[PDB]
Amino acid sequence: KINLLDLNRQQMREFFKDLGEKPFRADQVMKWMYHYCCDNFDEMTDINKVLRGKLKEVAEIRAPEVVEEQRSSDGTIKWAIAVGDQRVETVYIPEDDRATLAVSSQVGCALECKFCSTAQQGFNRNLRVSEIIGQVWRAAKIVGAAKVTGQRPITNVVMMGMGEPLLNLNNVVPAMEIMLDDFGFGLSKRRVTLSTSGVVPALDKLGDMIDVALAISLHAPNDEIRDEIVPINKKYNIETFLAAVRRYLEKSNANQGRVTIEYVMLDHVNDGTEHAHQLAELLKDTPCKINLIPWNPFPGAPYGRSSNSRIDRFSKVLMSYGFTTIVRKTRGDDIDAACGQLAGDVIDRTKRTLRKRMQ
Numbered sequence: 001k002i003n004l005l006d007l008n009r010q011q012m013r014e015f016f017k018d019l020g021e022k023p024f025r026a027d028q029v030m031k032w033m034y035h036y037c038c039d040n041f042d043e044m045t046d047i048n049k050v051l052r053g054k055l056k057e058v059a060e061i062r063a064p065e066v067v068e069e070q071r072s073s074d075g076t077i078k079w080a081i082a083v084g085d086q087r088v089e090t091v092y093i094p095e096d097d098r099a100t101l102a103v104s105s106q107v108g109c110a111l112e113c114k115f116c117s118t119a120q121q122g123f124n125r126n127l128r129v130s131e132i133i134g135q136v137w138r139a140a141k142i143v144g145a146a147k148v149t150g151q152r153p154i155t156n157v158v159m160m161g162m163g164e165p166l167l168n169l170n171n172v173v174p175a176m177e178i179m180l181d182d183f184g185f186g187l188s189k190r191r192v193t194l195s196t197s198g199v200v201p202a203l204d205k206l207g208d209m210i211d212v213a214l215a216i217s218l219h220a221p222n223d224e225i226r227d228e229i230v231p232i233n234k235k236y237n238i239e240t241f242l243a244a245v246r247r248y249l250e251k252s253n254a255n256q257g258r259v260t261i262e263y264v265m266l267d268h269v270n271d272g273t274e275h276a277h278q279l280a281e282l283l284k285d286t287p288c289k290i291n292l293i294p295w296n297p298f299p300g301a302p303y304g305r306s307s308n309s310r311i312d313r314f315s316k317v318l319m320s321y322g323f324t325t326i327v328r329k330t331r332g333d334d335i336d337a338a339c340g341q342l343a344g345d346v347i348d349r350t351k352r353t354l355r356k357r358m359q
């Protein structure tokens, strides 16, 4: 069967057209899928029985299943999401004004950032469209669909889970189109954020095919430090990445002329005042919002979390130059906040297979 979660509205309309139906019936079906979090054609009351019969025969609504769940005391929910044999993560982060979902793009990652727990695993495969938007669907359902509960479950989506989004453009863009779509999750392009370590050629391509909010993962004042922290800097350095960001903003207006800059705080690597000064000079031409993220530790990594006093000094240096700097609050401290810890080692795959036999 065709999984309807793989399709955007354009593709959803043409599918129904081959079924012998008028375009807006696809829109009507999407609405049941995303506004009500429905995966059952029998539950769709305002669709005629004939159309309902065609859909059950050739189509399915199969969302990724939750294999594990962790609820924090601050509201943060973290899920291990099954995608065939392997596992990926999805984190729900509730706030006062916003509700943010962290979605994964790939199974593992090939970019080997030394401060990321997914790096040590290595890359396995990219996710399908259904496997990316189905994280949102599944999260929305469990949290509570908009037209079921009355309140939207998810107001903000950030592609900051496992994987590098820009190395999966073919599946990530259509999935984001569904997030943006009114018959999908009806999100503003300000509320859909793609994070990237800096795959420059792909970033130039992203701007030609969609307009969403960009956030860059910088983590360094210079190229000498970033070669160590973020290996892709060896291929596309900071000034090549910054120049690519300006080219994107000339096409994009989701950022409103100001790119988001992610900057993790690692003990005595990139958190002294001398790094803040260098970073201020670096970005003097590029308008931005700087998010200072405290490093969530995990076993194995050769780094420590930066003391909050050093984070304040670092922040105040940048604020003196006139940069808008945000110190991001840590979420899920009582649980595994570290990105990629719940979905653990690769060898569990075999141990899961023996589990199902004696179930």
Ligand SMILES: C[S@@+](CC[C@H](N)C(=O)[O-])C[C@H]1O[C@@H](n2cnc3c(N)ncnc32)[C@H](O)[C@@H]1O
Pocket (backbone or CB within 6 Å): 115, 116, 117, 159, 160, 161, 162, 163, 164, 165, 195, 196, 197, 216, 217, 262, 263, 264, 293, 294, 295, 296, 297, 338, 339
């Ligand atoms: C996991 S990456 C995925 C998207 C993209 N490849 C990127 O690097 O931006 C998203 C963000 O998670 C953050 N991150 C990854 N591992 C972390 C860790 N162990 N502690 C704190 N932040 C982490 C990085 O700063 C990065 O900006």
Ligand code: SF4
Pocket (backbone or CB within 6 Å): 109, 110, 111, 112, 113, 116, 117, 118, 119, 161, 162, 163, 164, 197
């Ligand atoms: S930080 Fe982003 S790019 Fe670097 S390894 Fe982790 S997921 Fe891949």
